Amino acid sequence: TDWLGSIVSINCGDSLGVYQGRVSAVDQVSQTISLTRPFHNGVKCLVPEVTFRAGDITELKILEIPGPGDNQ
């Protein structure tokens, strides 16, 4: 759950491409990671939260590390 509060770029492979955003949630049981207000193709997604399975991610880039405070 260490990714929480970071800003990341998540590549989901050829079919969905790349999403960038703040990590708002991490679910260790379902093995997912949620981005709030993510961008895709240089534009803000219309949906405010998108949740990805870790097993679908081909590359995770850490754009900003979490800050030292409450990231929940």
From Swiss-Prot:
Subcellular location: Cytoplasm, P-body
Coiled coil spans: none
Distribution of this protein across tissues and organs: Expressed in theca and granulosa cells in ovary, and in spermatids of the meiotic division part II and apical membrane of Sertoli cells in testis (at protein level). Also expressed in brain and mammary gland.
Region (Required for P-body targeting and interaction with DCP1A): 1-72
Bilayer-spanning residue ranges: none
Superkingdom of origin organism: Eukaryota
Disease: Intellectual developmental disorder, autosomal recessive 50: A disorder characterized by significantly below average general intellectual functioning associated with impairments in adaptive behavior and manifested during the developmental period. MRT50 patients show mild intellectual disability and microcephaly.
Function: Binds single-stranded RNA. Involved in the process of mRNA degradation and in the positive regulation of mRNA decapping. May play a role in spermiogenesis and oogenesis.
Family: Belongs to the EDC3 family.
Summary of subunit composition and partner proteins: Homodimer (via YjeF N-terminal domain). Forms a complex with DCP1A, DCP2, DDX6 and EDC4/HEDLS, within this complex directly interacts with DCP1A and DDX6. Interacts with ZFP36.
Record-given protein name: Enhancer of mRNA-decapping protein 3
Organism: Homo sapiens
